[PDB]
Design a protein around this nucleic acid. Structure first.
Length: 106
RNA sequence: CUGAUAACUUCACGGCGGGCUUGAUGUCCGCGUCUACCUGGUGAACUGCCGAGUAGGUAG
């Protein structure tokens, strides 16, 4: 996977109004990454939820082969997953976790 | 088979000095709670003697 400066400009420009979703990520240092980084040197704003966690109900009620795994705690994960969003990780990370688990246990 | 594998940010740090919130103030008038009403001991711990003795000891 690689990055598109065109998608970076699309996801860049609109959020200047909405600073509630601003996540300033200054990069390598603006010498050799490219002039598209020199254009917005310092800001590099990206997408985040704009609100913290909350309190849900897990369930209101009370195939098969349901294998139950509680209380997985992940410290030091990856939040900058896409080039443009900042928040929860990828779903291909969870897919790779599950596929590595079955390729162990088979 | 996880934008793959690896990845010690840290050391020091005196927000202090001063300060009159007060003046005045009629809440009141009126007011019928009433009618009715079975808690029961089945028969169920007796008859005597001594003690001057509502106290006190006896025999069965």
């Amino acid at each position: 996977p690689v990055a598109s400066l065109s998608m970076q400009s699309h996801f860049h420009q609109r959020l200047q109004d909405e600073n509630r979703h601003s996540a300033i990520t200054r990069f390598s240092r603006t010498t050799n990454m490219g002039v598209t980084a020199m254009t917005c040197g310092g800001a590099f704003r990206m997408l985040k939820s704009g609100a913290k966690f909350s309190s849900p109900p897990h369930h209101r009620l009370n195939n098969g082969s349901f294998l139950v795994l509680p209380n997985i705690r992940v410290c030091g994960a990856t939040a900058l997953s896409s080039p443009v969003t900042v928040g929860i990780p990828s779903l291909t990370a969870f897919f790779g976790f599950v596929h590595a688990f079955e390729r162990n246990i088979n």
